[PDB]
Amino acid sequence: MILLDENTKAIVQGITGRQGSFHTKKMLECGTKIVGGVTPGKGGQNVHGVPVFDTVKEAVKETDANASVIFVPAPFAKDAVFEAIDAGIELIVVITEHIPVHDTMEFVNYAEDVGVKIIGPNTPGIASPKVGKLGIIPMEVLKEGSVGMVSRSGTLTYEIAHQIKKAGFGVSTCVGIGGDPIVGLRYKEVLDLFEKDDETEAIVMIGEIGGGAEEEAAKFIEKMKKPVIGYIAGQGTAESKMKALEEAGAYVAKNISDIPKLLAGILG
């Protein structure tokens, strides 16, 4: 029951690509333990000091990596995820957008049976100020703290994170579950992980209209020990989600400005 922590040793698949190289630089800059990269035919090289391997198996061998962040283009992403799963990697963050849904369904199914954690696809990833990030989340809007954040949106999450930080609060772990129709870990799994994360004292759950992801997580919130603040953008409907969250015991923020106010009441 662990996501990103001090024991994380990650590899970057698609490390030589433009996006992979740039984000590897930014991940290194915030202290992320990136121990290797993978790009067929680039073995032996290095990107921003990180050693490149031709395959995940080779990379895992020399580094004992237990996590991977994937930037591989959509047509080749499924094979990259299977490669990471085949190699024993337990946490796989899939940044790539536009992966054919049947491809995603295949790797999400394989991973769940094996017990691997897939974050995404089409997600900015995960960020934990204390140890770094796996993905593209802007660390400028986060500072070390005890607020756990889970969302399935992009920009909105940063706007909210910005307001939270400006109000003086820090984040333990921020996780984006992804914006595609089929994804890996859902709200419930992330909330469960937050419940068992000593670094997390309060949770900010960000949703929006459409789907039933928030409604399904409401069931779990009912038995959670840690306080949950819920915010739904776009006020299946926003009202339906706010009602389900409120009935489950979550504290519903009507406006983003209410989130820091509730955190002040909960955390001081």
Side-chain angles (χ1 to χ4, degrees), residues 2-224 226-268:
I2 62 166
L3 286 166
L4 174 59
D5 60 32
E6 54 268 52
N7 295 148
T8 301
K9 291 186 165 56
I11 56 165
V12 177
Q13 290 175 252
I15 194 172
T16 56
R18 309 142 201 169
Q19 172 178 37
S21 180
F22 171 67
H23 291 298
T24 289
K25 182 178 66 168
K26 302 308 298 287
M27 281 182 274
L28 287 168
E29 304 197 320
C30 64
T32 313
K33 296 296 175 288
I34 301 293
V35 298
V38 175
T39 290
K42 299 283 190 170
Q45 297 175 50
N46 86 62
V47 171
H48 297 299
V50 180
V52 184
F53 299 94
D54 292 312
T55 68
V56 174
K57 193 192 309 182
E58 295 175 313
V60 173
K61 275 208 63 298
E62 183 178 296
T63 73
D64 288 66
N66 51 29
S68 180
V69 59
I70 298 178
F71 287 96
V72 172
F76 309 113
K78 184 194 71 171
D79 291 335
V81 181
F82 270 63
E83 190 178 346
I85 298 177
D86 284 357
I89 296 175
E90 301 265 54
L91 176 60
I92 298 168
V93 182
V94 190
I95 305 299
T96 310
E97 297 176 59
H98 309 311
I99 295 177
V101 298
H102 193 271
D103 284 5
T104 295
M105 294 161 95
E106 290 187 355
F107 66 73
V108 161
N109 286 351
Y110 181 17
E112 61 178 20
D113 288 340
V114 175
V116 165
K117 300 192 197 78
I118 293 290
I119 301 299
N122 183 25
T123 175
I126 182 165
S128 191
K130 189 146 305 179
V131 300
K133 79 184 182 176
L134 290 181
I136 62 181
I137 290 167
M139 298 306 281
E140 188 63 42
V141 298
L142 304 182
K143 70 169 181 172
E144 282 182 50
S146 66
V147 184
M149 299 178 66
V150 57
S151 179
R152 62 187 176 96
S153 61
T155 310
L156 172 69
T157 304
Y158 310 147
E159 174 185 16
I160 288 167
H162 180 205
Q163 305 313 313
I164 289 180
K165 180 177 173 173
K166 180 157 56 64
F169 301 99
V171 166
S172 46
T173 288
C174 175
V175 181
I177 63 172
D180 282 1
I182 304 305
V183 296
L185 266 64
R186 302 290 286 296
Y187 285 115
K188 178 186 171 187
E189 298 108 294
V190 178
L191 292 165
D192 192 17
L193 292 170
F194 284 162
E195 275 277 295
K196 297 168 186 173
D197 178 26
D198 288 348
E199 295 293 307
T200 301
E201 291 181 51
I203 295 101
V204 174
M205 176 175 158
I206 299 157
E208 37 190 293
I209 56 178
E214 295 83 343
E215 288 92 329
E216 252 303 296
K219 330 278 195 174
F220 184 78
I221 289 174
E222 298 197 302
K223 307 305 169 182
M224 284 177 71
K226 298 175 179 183
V228 175
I229 293 172
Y231 177 74
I232 305 303
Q235 291 169 57
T237 64
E239 268 48 49
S240 174
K241 296 172 183 299
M242 284 171 90
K243 300 273 73 180
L245 291 172
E246 216 145 51
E247 294 190 58
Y251 304 125
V252 178
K254 182 186 181 183
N255 291 87
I256 295 173
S257 60
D258 292 316
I259 300 175
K261 295 179 178 182
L262 295 169
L263 286 173
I266 299 169
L267 302 171

mmCIF file of all heavy atoms in Angstrom, residues 114-159:
data_model
loop_
_atom_site.group_PDB
_atom_site.id
_atom_site.type_symbol
_atom_site.label_atom_id
_atom_site.label_comp_id
_atom_site.label_asym_id
_atom_site.label_seq_id
_atom_site.Cartn_x
_atom_site.Cartn_y
_atom_site.Cartn_z
ATOM 1 N N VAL A 114 -2.108 -8.929 -11.669
ATOM 2 C CA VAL A 114 -0.785 -9.101 -11.075
ATOM 3 C C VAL A 114 -0.638 -8.357 -9.739
ATOM 4 O O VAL A 114 0.164 -8.747 -8.891
ATOM 5 C CB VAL A 114 0.308 -8.620 -12.066
ATOM 6 C CG1 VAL A 114 1.690 -8.681 -11.420
ATOM 7 C CG2 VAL A 114 0.282 -9.494 -13.320
ATOM 8 N N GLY A 115 -1.421 -7.301 -9.546
ATOM 9 C CA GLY A 115 -1.347 -6.528 -8.311
ATOM 10 C C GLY A 115 -0.497 -5.275 -8.443
ATOM 11 O O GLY A 115 -0.099 -4.659 -7.451
ATOM 12 N N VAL A 116 -0.207 -4.907 -9.686
ATOM 13 C CA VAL A 116 0.597 -3.729 -10.010
ATOM 14 C C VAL A 116 -0.301 -2.494 -9.947
ATOM 15 O O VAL A 116 -1.504 -2.589 -10.209
ATOM 16 C CB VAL A 116 1.154 -3.854 -11.468
ATOM 17 C CG1 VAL A 116 1.691 -2.511 -11.977
ATOM 18 C CG2 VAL A 116 2.231 -4.925 -11.516
ATOM 19 N N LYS A 117 0.278 -1.341 -9.614
ATOM 20 C CA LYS A 117 -0.484 -0.098 -9.572
ATOM 21 C C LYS A 117 -0.250 0.726 -10.841
ATOM 22 O O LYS A 117 0.883 1.127 -11.127
ATOM 23 C CB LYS A 117 -0.075 0.764 -8.369
ATOM 24 C CG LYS A 117 -0.278 0.139 -6.997
ATOM 25 C CD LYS A 117 -0.111 1.196 -5.898
ATOM 26 C CE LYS A 117 0.118 0.563 -4.520
ATOM 27 N NZ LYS A 117 1.530 0.083 -4.331
ATOM 28 N N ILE A 118 -1.313 0.952 -11.606
ATOM 29 C CA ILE A 118 -1.222 1.782 -12.805
ATOM 30 C C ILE A 118 -1.844 3.128 -12.455
ATOM 31 O O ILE A 118 -2.961 3.180 -11.927
ATOM 32 C CB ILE A 118 -2.041 1.192 -13.996
ATOM 33 C CG1 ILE A 118 -1.421 -0.122 -14.478
ATOM 34 C CG2 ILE A 118 -2.089 2.192 -15.145
ATOM 35 C CD1 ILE A 118 -0.094 0.051 -15.168
ATOM 36 N N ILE A 119 -1.112 4.211 -12.719
ATOM 37 C CA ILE A 119 -1.637 5.554 -12.502
ATOM 38 C C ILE A 119 -1.776 6.128 -13.907
ATOM 39 O O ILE A 119 -0.779 6.309 -14.619
ATOM 40 C CB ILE A 119 -0.668 6.445 -11.680
ATOM 41 C CG1 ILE A 119 -0.398 5.815 -10.314
ATOM 42 C CG2 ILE A 119 -1.266 7.848 -11.510
ATOM 43 C CD1 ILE A 119 -1.613 5.643 -9.451
ATOM 44 N N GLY A 120 -3.016 6.385 -14.313
ATOM 45 C CA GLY A 120 -3.262 6.915 -15.645
ATOM 46 C C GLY A 120 -3.947 5.855 -16.491
ATOM 47 O O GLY A 120 -4.561 4.935 -15.941
ATOM 48 N N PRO A 121 -3.828 5.917 -17.825
ATOM 49 C CA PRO A 121 -3.070 6.926 -18.573
ATOM 50 C C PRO A 121 -3.685 8.337 -18.638
ATOM 51 O O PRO A 121 -4.676 8.632 -17.969
ATOM 52 C CB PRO A 121 -2.917 6.278 -19.949
ATOM 53 C CG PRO A 121 -4.298 5.621 -20.130
ATOM 54 C CD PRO A 121 -4.588 5.026 -18.733
ATOM 55 N N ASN A 122 -3.069 9.196 -19.444
ATOM 56 C CA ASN A 122 -3.506 10.587 -19.599
ATOM 57 C C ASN A 122 -3.619 11.256 -18.239
ATOM 58 O O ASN A 122 -4.661 11.801 -17.862
ATOM 59 C CB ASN A 122 -4.844 10.642 -20.342
ATOM 60 C CG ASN A 122 -5.317 12.061 -20.587
ATOM 61 O OD1 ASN A 122 -4.518 13.003 -20.649
ATOM 62 N ND2 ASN A 122 -6.629 12.217 -20.747
ATOM 63 N N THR A 123 -2.515 11.208 -17.504
ATOM 64 C CA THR A 123 -2.450 11.791 -16.166
ATOM 65 C C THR A 123 -1.166 12.594 -16.042
ATOM 66 O O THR A 123 -0.207 12.331 -16.755
ATOM 67 C CB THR A 123 -2.393 10.705 -15.062
ATOM 68 O OG1 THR A 123 -2.222 11.340 -13.787
ATOM 69 C CG2 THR A 123 -1.192 9.746 -15.261
ATOM 70 N N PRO A 124 -1.159 13.625 -15.183
ATOM 71 C CA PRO A 124 0.069 14.402 -15.008
ATOM 72 C C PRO A 124 0.923 13.604 -14.030
ATOM 73 O O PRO A 124 2.075 13.933 -13.783
ATOM 74 C CB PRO A 124 -0.419 15.715 -14.401
ATOM 75 C CG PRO A 124 -1.644 15.301 -13.667
ATOM 76 C CD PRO A 124 -2.317 14.363 -14.647
ATOM 77 N N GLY A 125 0.331 12.562 -13.450
ATOM 78 C CA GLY A 125 1.098 11.693 -12.566
ATOM 79 C C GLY A 125 0.926 11.864 -11.077
ATOM 80 O O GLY A 125 -0.171 12.124 -10.599
ATOM 81 N N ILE A 126 2.029 11.706 -10.347
ATOM 82 C CA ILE A 126 2.001 11.814 -8.898
ATOM 83 C C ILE A 126 3.121 12.738 -8.428
ATOM 84 O O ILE A 126 4.196 12.791 -9.034
ATOM 85 C CB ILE A 126 2.149 10.402 -8.262
ATOM 86 C CG1 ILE A 126 2.085 10.487 -6.733
ATOM 87 C CG2 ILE A 126 3.450 9.754 -8.741
ATOM 88 C CD1 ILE A 126 1.854 9.131 -6.079
ATOM 89 N N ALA A 127 2.864 13.486 -7.354
ATOM 90 C CA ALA A 127 3.883 14.381 -6.821
ATOM 91 C C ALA A 127 3.830 14.380 -5.306
ATOM 92 O O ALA A 127 2.767 14.516 -4.714
ATOM 93 C CB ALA A 127 3.688 15.798 -7.359
ATOM 94 N N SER A 128 4.992 14.208 -4.683
ATOM 95 C CA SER A 128 5.097 14.189 -3.231
ATOM 96 C C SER A 128 6.339 15.038 -2.934
ATOM 97 O O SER A 128 7.461 14.552 -2.996
ATOM 98 C CB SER A 128 5.282 12.745 -2.752
ATOM 99 O OG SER A 128 5.137 12.664 -1.337
ATOM 100 N N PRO A 129 6.139 16.329 -2.623
ATOM 101 C CA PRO A 129 7.214 17.286 -2.334
ATOM 102 C C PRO A 129 8.405 16.751 -1.550
ATOM 103 O O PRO A 129 9.555 17.077 -1.852
ATOM 104 C CB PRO A 129 6.485 18.407 -1.603
ATOM 105 C CG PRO A 129 5.142 18.405 -2.283
ATOM 106 C CD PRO A 129 4.828 16.927 -2.314
ATOM 107 N N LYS A 130 8.131 15.918 -0.562
ATOM 108 C CA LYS A 130 9.196 15.372 0.263
ATOM 109 C C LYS A 130 10.200 14.514 -0.507
ATOM 110 O O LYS A 130 11.394 14.506 -0.177
ATOM 111 C CB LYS A 130 8.585 14.575 1.418
ATOM 112 C CG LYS A 130 9.582 14.136 2.481
ATOM 113 C CD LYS A 130 8.927 14.147 3.856
ATOM 114 C CE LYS A 130 8.322 15.518 4.149
ATOM 115 N NZ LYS A 130 7.632 15.606 5.470
ATOM 116 N N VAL A 131 9.740 13.811 -1.544
ATOM 117 C CA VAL A 131 10.638 12.944 -2.305
ATOM 118 C C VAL A 131 10.734 13.188 -3.809
ATOM 119 O O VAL A 131 11.589 12.603 -4.468
ATOM 120 C CB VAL A 131 10.293 11.461 -2.089
ATOM 121 C CG1 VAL A 131 10.430 11.107 -0.616
ATOM 122 C CG2 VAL A 131 8.883 11.174 -2.560
ATOM 123 N N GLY A 132 9.871 14.040 -4.358
ATOM 124 C CA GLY A 132 9.949 14.310 -5.788
ATOM 125 C C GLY A 132 8.631 14.112 -6.511
ATOM 126 O O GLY A 132 7.565 14.362 -5.941
ATOM 127 N N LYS A 133 8.694 13.667 -7.760
ATOM 128 C CA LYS A 133 7.475 13.463 -8.531
ATOM 129 C C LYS A 133 7.706 12.481 -9.679
ATOM 130 O O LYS A 133 8.824 12.298 -10.137
ATOM 131 C CB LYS A 133 6.992 14.809 -9.095
ATOM 132 C CG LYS A 133 7.751 15.285 -10.335
ATOM 133 C CD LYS A 133 7.271 16.656 -10.768
ATOM 134 C CE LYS A 133 7.999 17.115 -12.041
ATOM 135 N NZ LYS A 133 7.486 18.422 -12.569
ATOM 136 N N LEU A 134 6.638 11.833 -10.132
ATOM 137 C CA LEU A 134 6.729 10.937 -11.270
ATOM 138 C C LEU A 134 5.714 11.526 -12.223
ATOM 139 O O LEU A 134 4.507 11.325 -12.069
ATOM 140 C CB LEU A 134 6.352 9.507 -10.866
ATOM 141 C CG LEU A 134 7.391 8.839 -9.952
ATOM 142 C CD1 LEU A 134 6.920 7.427 -9.636
ATOM 143 C CD2 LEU A 134 8.754 8.779 -10.630
ATOM 144 N N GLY A 135 6.205 12.277 -13.197
ATOM 145 C CA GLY A 135 5.299 12.917 -14.122
ATOM 146 C C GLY A 135 5.646 14.359 -14.427
ATOM 147 O O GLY A 135 6.819 14.751 -14.432
ATOM 148 N N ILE A 136 4.601 15.151 -14.644
ATOM 149 C CA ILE A 136 4.731 16.543 -15.057
ATOM 150 C C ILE A 136 4.060 17.576 -14.148
ATOM 151 O O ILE A 136 3.893 18.728 -14.538
ATOM 152 C CB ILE A 136 4.126 16.687 -16.483
ATOM 153 C CG1 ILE A 136 2.633 16.328 -16.450
ATOM 154 C CG2 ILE A 136 4.816 15.694 -17.455
ATOM 155 C CD1 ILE A 136 1.925 16.404 -17.827
ATOM 156 N N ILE A 137 3.690 17.192 -12.934
ATOM 157 C CA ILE A 137 3.011 18.142 -12.064
ATOM 158 C C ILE A 137 3.967 19.290 -11.713
ATOM 159 O O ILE A 137 5.102 19.051 -11.336
ATOM 160 C CB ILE A 137 2.516 17.439 -10.773
ATOM 161 C CG1 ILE A 137 1.352 16.486 -11.114
ATOM 162 C CG2 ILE A 137 2.097 18.487 -9.749
ATOM 163 C CD1 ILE A 137 1.007 15.518 -9.983
ATOM 164 N N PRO A 138 3.513 20.552 -11.847
ATOM 165 C CA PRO A 138 4.378 21.705 -11.529
ATOM 166 C C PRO A 138 4.631 21.827 -10.026
ATOM 167 O O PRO A 138 3.715 22.108 -9.261
ATOM 168 C CB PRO A 138 3.601 22.892 -12.091
ATOM 169 C CG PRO A 138 2.171 22.456 -12.020
ATOM 170 C CD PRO A 138 2.229 20.987 -12.427
ATOM 171 N N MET A 139 5.877 21.623 -9.610
ATOM 172 C CA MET A 139 6.195 21.678 -8.191
ATOM 173 C C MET A 139 6.099 23.091 -7.625
ATOM 174 O O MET A 139 6.066 23.292 -6.413
ATOM 175 C CB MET A 139 7.576 21.062 -7.950
ATOM 176 C CG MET A 139 7.653 19.588 -8.329
ATOM 177 S SD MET A 139 6.398 18.541 -7.545
ATOM 178 C CE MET A 139 7.126 18.335 -5.914
ATOM 179 N N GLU A 140 6.020 24.079 -8.507
ATOM 180 C CA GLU A 140 5.891 25.461 -8.063
ATOM 181 C C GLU A 140 4.611 25.701 -7.246
ATOM 182 O O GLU A 140 4.572 26.597 -6.393
ATOM 183 C CB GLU A 140 5.895 26.393 -9.280
ATOM 184 C CG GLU A 140 5.950 27.860 -8.924
ATOM 185 C CD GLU A 140 7.227 28.238 -8.193
ATOM 186 O OE1 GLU A 140 8.314 27.753 -8.590
ATOM 187 O OE2 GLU A 140 7.141 29.030 -7.236
ATOM 188 N N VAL A 141 3.564 24.913 -7.486
ATOM 189 C CA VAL A 141 2.308 25.116 -6.764
ATOM 190 C C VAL A 141 2.115 24.191 -5.559
ATOM 191 O O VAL A 141 1.013 24.099 -5.024
ATOM 192 C CB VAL A 141 1.076 24.970 -7.701
ATOM 193 C CG1 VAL A 141 1.114 26.039 -8.797
ATOM 194 C CG2 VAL A 141 1.034 23.578 -8.303
ATOM 195 N N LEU A 142 3.187 23.513 -5.152
ATOM 196 C CA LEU A 142 3.164 22.606 -4.005
ATOM 197 C C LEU A 142 4.304 22.890 -3.055
ATOM 198 O O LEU A 142 5.359 23.351 -3.468
ATOM 199 C CB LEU A 142 3.358 21.155 -4.441
ATOM 200 C CG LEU A 142 2.412 20.556 -5.472
ATOM 201 C CD1 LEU A 142 2.802 19.106 -5.692
ATOM 202 C CD2 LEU A 142 0.985 20.645 -4.980
ATOM 203 N N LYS A 143 4.080 22.611 -1.777
ATOM 204 C CA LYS A 143 5.139 22.721 -0.787
ATOM 205 C C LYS A 143 4.877 21.534 0.131
ATOM 206 O O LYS A 143 3.766 20.989 0.136
ATOM 207 C CB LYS A 143 5.105 24.067 -0.030
ATOM 208 C CG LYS A 143 3.962 24.281 0.937
ATOM 209 C CD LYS A 143 4.243 25.519 1.784
ATOM 210 C CE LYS A 143 3.146 25.767 2.801
ATOM 211 N NZ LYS A 143 3.513 26.864 3.742
ATOM 212 N N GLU A 144 5.897 21.096 0.864
ATOM 213 C CA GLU A 144 5.755 19.962 1.775
ATOM 214 C C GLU A 144 4.698 20.194 2.844
ATOM 215 O O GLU A 144 4.690 21.234 3.512
ATOM 216 C CB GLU A 144 7.077 19.672 2.480
ATOM 217 C CG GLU A 144 8.101 18.939 1.654
ATOM 218 C CD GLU A 144 9.360 18.654 2.455
ATOM 219 O OE1 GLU A 144 9.232 18.132 3.584
ATOM 220 O OE2 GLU A 144 10.470 18.946 1.956
ATOM 221 N N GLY A 145 3.820 19.211 3.015
ATOM 222 C CA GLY A 145 2.771 19.337 4.008
ATOM 223 C C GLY A 145 2.004 18.052 4.245
ATOM 224 O O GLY A 145 2.472 16.956 3.905
ATOM 225 N N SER A 146 0.801 18.192 4.798
ATOM 226 C CA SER A 146 -0.011 17.031 5.135
ATOM 227 C C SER A 146 -1.299 16.860 4.363
ATOM 228 O O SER A 146 -2.091 15.986 4.698
ATOM 229 C CB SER A 146 -0.337 17.052 6.636
ATOM 230 O OG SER A 146 -1.161 18.158 6.969
ATOM 231 N N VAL A 147 -1.520 17.669 3.332
ATOM 232 C CA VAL A 147 -2.748 17.540 2.563
ATOM 233 C C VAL A 147 -2.583 16.606 1.367
ATOM 234 O O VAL A 147 -1.708 16.821 0.530
ATOM 235 C CB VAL A 147 -3.253 18.906 2.045
ATOM 236 C CG1 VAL A 147 -4.595 18.717 1.327
ATOM 237 C CG2 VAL A 147 -3.402 19.896 3.199
ATOM 238 N N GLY A 148 -3.405 15.559 1.312
ATOM 239 C CA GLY A 148 -3.353 14.629 0.188
ATOM 240 C C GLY A 148 -4.369 15.098 -0.829
ATOM 241 O O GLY A 148 -5.496 15.455 -0.462
ATOM 242 N N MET A 149 -3.998 15.107 -2.108
ATOM 243 C CA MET A 149 -4.900 15.570 -3.152
ATOM 244 C C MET A 149 -5.073 14.478 -4.191
ATOM 245 O O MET A 149 -4.107 13.819 -4.562
ATOM 246 C CB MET A 149 -4.340 16.813 -3.864
ATOM 247 C CG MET A 149 -4.122 18.020 -2.967
ATOM 248 S SD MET A 149 -3.404 19.408 -3.903
ATOM 249 C CE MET A 149 -4.756 19.765 -4.998
ATOM 250 N N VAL A 150 -6.306 14.288 -4.636
ATOM 251 C CA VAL A 150 -6.590 13.312 -5.698
ATOM 252 C C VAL A 150 -7.562 13.982 -6.655
ATOM 253 O O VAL A 150 -8.547 14.607 -6.231
ATOM 254 C CB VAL A 150 -7.175 11.993 -5.149
ATOM 255 C CG1 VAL A 150 -8.445 12.240 -4.357
ATOM 256 C CG2 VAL A 150 -7.454 11.050 -6.327
ATOM 257 N N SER A 151 -7.286 13.854 -7.953
ATOM 258 C CA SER A 151 -8.086 14.512 -8.975
ATOM 259 C C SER A 151 -8.038 13.709 -10.261
ATOM 260 O O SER A 151 -7.228 12.793 -10.387
ATOM 261 C CB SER A 151 -7.467 15.900 -9.223
ATOM 262 O OG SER A 151 -8.148 16.638 -10.210
ATOM 263 N N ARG A 152 -8.894 14.067 -11.213
ATOM 264 C CA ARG A 152 -8.908 13.413 -12.518
ATOM 265 C C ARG A 152 -8.889 14.492 -13.597
ATOM 266 O O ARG A 152 -9.244 14.256 -14.754
ATOM 267 C CB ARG A 152 -10.132 12.486 -12.665
ATOM 268 C CG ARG A 152 -11.482 13.159 -12.588
ATOM 269 C CD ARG A 152 -12.586 12.100 -12.578
ATOM 270 N NE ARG A 152 -13.908 12.702 -12.405
ATOM 271 C CZ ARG A 152 -14.737 13.006 -13.401
ATOM 272 N NH1 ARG A 152 -14.396 12.762 -14.663
ATOM 273 N NH2 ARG A 152 -15.909 13.564 -13.131
ATOM 274 N N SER A 153 -8.449 15.688 -13.205
ATOM 275 C CA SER A 153 -8.361 16.816 -14.131
ATOM 276 C C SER A 153 -6.928 17.323 -14.214
ATOM 277 O O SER A 153 -6.046 16.865 -13.490
ATOM 278 C CB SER A 153 -9.285 17.962 -13.685
ATOM 279 O OG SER A 153 -8.923 18.447 -12.399
ATOM 280 N N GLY A 154 -6.695 18.275 -15.105
ATOM 281 C CA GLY A 154 -5.363 18.818 -15.236
ATOM 282 C C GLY A 154 -5.239 20.172 -14.570
ATOM 283 O O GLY A 154 -5.023 20.274 -13.364
ATOM 284 N N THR A 155 -5.386 21.212 -15.378
ATOM 285 C CA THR A 155 -5.276 22.597 -14.943
ATOM 286 C C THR A 155 -5.964 22.903 -13.614
ATOM 287 O O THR A 155 -5.365 23.495 -12.717
ATOM 288 C CB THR A 155 -5.836 23.523 -16.034
ATOM 289 O OG1 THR A 155 -5.240 23.172 -17.292
ATOM 290 C CG2 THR A 155 -5.525 24.976 -15.722
ATOM 291 N N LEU A 156 -7.226 22.508 -13.501
ATOM 292 C CA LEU A 156 -8.000 22.733 -12.283
ATOM 293 C C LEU A 156 -7.248 22.316 -11.028
ATOM 294 O O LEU A 156 -7.278 23.015 -10.017
ATOM 295 C CB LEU A 156 -9.317 21.955 -12.354
ATOM 296 C CG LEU A 156 -10.166 21.933 -11.077
ATOM 297 C CD1 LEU A 156 -10.744 23.317 -10.812
ATOM 298 C CD2 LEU A 156 -11.286 20.912 -11.227
ATOM 299 N N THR A 157 -6.587 21.164 -11.082
ATOM 300 C CA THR A 157 -5.840 20.668 -9.928
ATOM 301 C C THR A 157 -4.752 21.634 -9.506
ATOM 302 O O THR A 157 -4.483 21.795 -8.318
ATOM 303 C CB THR A 157 -5.167 19.321 -10.216
ATOM 304 O OG1 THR A 157 -6.156 18.374 -10.637
ATOM 305 C CG2 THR A 157 -4.483 18.787 -8.962
ATOM 306 N N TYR A 158 -4.115 22.266 -10.488
ATOM 307 C CA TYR A 158 -3.045 23.203 -10.184
ATOM 308 C C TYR A 158 -3.605 24.504 -9.644
ATOM 309 O O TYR A 158 -3.011 25.110 -8.762
ATOM 310 C CB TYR A 158 -2.197 23.472 -11.428
ATOM 311 C CG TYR A 158 -1.738 22.211 -12.127
ATOM 312 C CD1 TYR A 158 -1.579 22.182 -13.507
ATOM 313 C CD2 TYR A 158 -1.455 21.050 -11.402
ATOM 314 C CE1 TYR A 158 -1.146 21.022 -14.160
ATOM 315 C CE2 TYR A 158 -1.033 19.891 -12.039
ATOM 316 C CZ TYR A 158 -0.879 19.884 -13.418
ATOM 317 O OH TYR A 158 -0.472 18.741 -14.066
ATOM 318 N N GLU A 159 -4.743 24.941 -10.178
ATOM 319 C CA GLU A 159 -5.372 26.171 -9.688
ATOM 320 C C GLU A 159 -5.670 25.944 -8.213
ATOM 321 O O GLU A 159 -5.340 26.769 -7.359
ATOM 322 C CB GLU A 159 -6.680 26.455 -10.426
ATOM 323 C CG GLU A 159 -7.429 27.645 -9.848
ATOM 324 C CD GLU A 159 -8.773 27.868 -10.499
ATOM 325 O OE1 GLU A 159 -9.275 26.946 -11.174
ATOM 326 O OE2 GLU A 159 -9.340 28.965 -10.323
#
